[PDB]
Design a protein around this ligand. Structure first.
Ligand SMILES: NC(=O)c1ccc[n+]([C@@H]2O[C@H](COP(=O)([O-])OP(=O)(O)OC[C@H]3O[C@@H](n4cnc5c(N)ncnc54)[C@H](OP(=O)(O)O)[C@@H]3O)[C@@H](O)[C@H]2O)c1
Ligand SMILES: COc1ccc2cc([C@H](C)C(=O)O)ccc2c1
Length: 316
């Protein structure tokens, strides 16, 4: 048994997920080990993506832990994400099948539209012209979404959702004529310096689950993230609270999300921090602590993905 939330399609999502992205210079071997450790520690939800270039390793971890008798497939919730070179509707299922082939899994539990800006089809995930300009594409995300819904009907994705959508883009999908399956979730950046209250309430109102990424203040990797931005975990109130509960600032940040009805991801490739993070289910925060964490909010977005700024669908 483990804590899950009922999704709007009737499937269940474990409320703590294991983030698997690491910078290109971390060897891929470390993903294999880290995901095995995550499963051993009690993570039942694993979050990856095509663009993380780790699905071979992440899939091997999962296969290994099923084959070794540690876990059944039905007690792993695995998420992949459709990258923006395959937004064209005819390209959606091939991209999902490619991920499945890399993973050697029969299905993903969740398939997400990773980012709403589309780029040119082909093998390169960030296609550039000869002068280094990103090659943007124009695609109707409503047609992308229909192709996702067919992947669900094919059984290849148990559930489908989105990521890095704003209000407008979610409404675009929700208000789509002939809409068959709402998104189960919107995975977006969320932490005490960017608590997303507005978008969170919107999602709740539509029974869409908000899935928090960079819940611990992000990988802080250059050039994805500005090195001058404030370190979330160094925050005095979070450290005060941690010290008080004999926990860690990370644990306080993750607990904050769980109590406000957000599903929270946490990446770590460190054995001790992997085990530490599952301790989020061992303590609880009072209303006064929760309000204190709310007051940290300061509109700090770590992940702008601004190399994809310009086209209309850029979400921030
Ligand atoms: N949909 C998207 O666009 C999108 C965007 C960003 C992230 N994501 C997903 O969300 C996941 C997590 O977000 P993220 O990678 O930015 O990092 P995140 O979880 O905020 O955490 C970042 C850093 O926290 C450290 N950490 C973990 N546990 C800790 C602890 N208990 N105490 C102190 N430090 C701790 C990790 O380092 P160690 O590894 O050394 O422990 C990691 O570098 C990603 O891996 C990915 O699956 C999705
Ligand atoms: C190699 O090319 C990429 C492209 C897009 C990426 C998006 C992301 C986001 C930050 C994410 O979902 O973590 C990560 C890595 C990426 C690598």
């Amino acid at each position: 048994k483990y804590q899950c939330v009922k999704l709007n399609d009737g499937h269940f999502m474990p409320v703590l997920g294991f983030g698997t992205y690491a910078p290109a210079e971390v060897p891929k071997s470390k993903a294999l080990e880290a995901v095995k450790l995550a499963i051993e520690a009690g993570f039942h939800h694993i979050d990856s993506a095509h663009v993380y270039n780790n699905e071979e390793q992440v899939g091997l971890a999962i296969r290994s832990k099923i084959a070794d008798g540690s876990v059944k497939r039905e007690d792993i919730f695995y998420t992949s994400k459709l990258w923006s070179n395959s937004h064209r509707p005819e390209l959606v299922r091939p991209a999902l099948e490619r991920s499945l082939k890399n993973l050697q899994l029969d299905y993903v539990d969740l398939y997400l539209i990773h980012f709403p800006v589309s780029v040119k089809p082909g093998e390169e995930v960030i296609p550039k012209d000869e002068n280094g300009k990103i090659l943007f594409d124009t695609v109707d995300l409503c047609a992308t979404w229909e192709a996702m819904e067919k992947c669900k009907d094919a059984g290849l994705a148990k559930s489908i959702g989105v990521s890095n959508f704003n209000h407008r883009l979610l409404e675009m999908i929700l208000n789509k004529p002939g809409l068959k399956y709402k998104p189960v979730c919107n995975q977006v950046e969320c932490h005490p310096y960017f608590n997303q209250r507005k978008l969170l309430d919107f999602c709740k109102s539509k029974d869409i689950v908000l899935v928090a990424y960079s819940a611990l203040g992000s990988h802080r990797e250059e050039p994805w993230v500005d090195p001058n931005s404030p370190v979330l975990l160094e925050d005095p109130v979070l450290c005060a609270l941690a010290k008080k509960h004999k926990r860690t600032p990370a644990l306080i940040a993750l607990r904050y999300q769980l109590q406000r009805g957000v599903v929270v991801l946490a990446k770590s490739y460190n054995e001790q921090r992997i085990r530490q993070n599952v301790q989020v289910f061992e303590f609880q925060l009072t209303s006064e602590e929760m309000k204190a964490i709310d007051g940290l909010n300061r509109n700090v977005r770590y992940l702008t993905l601004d190399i994809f700024a310009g086209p209309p669908n850029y979400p921030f």
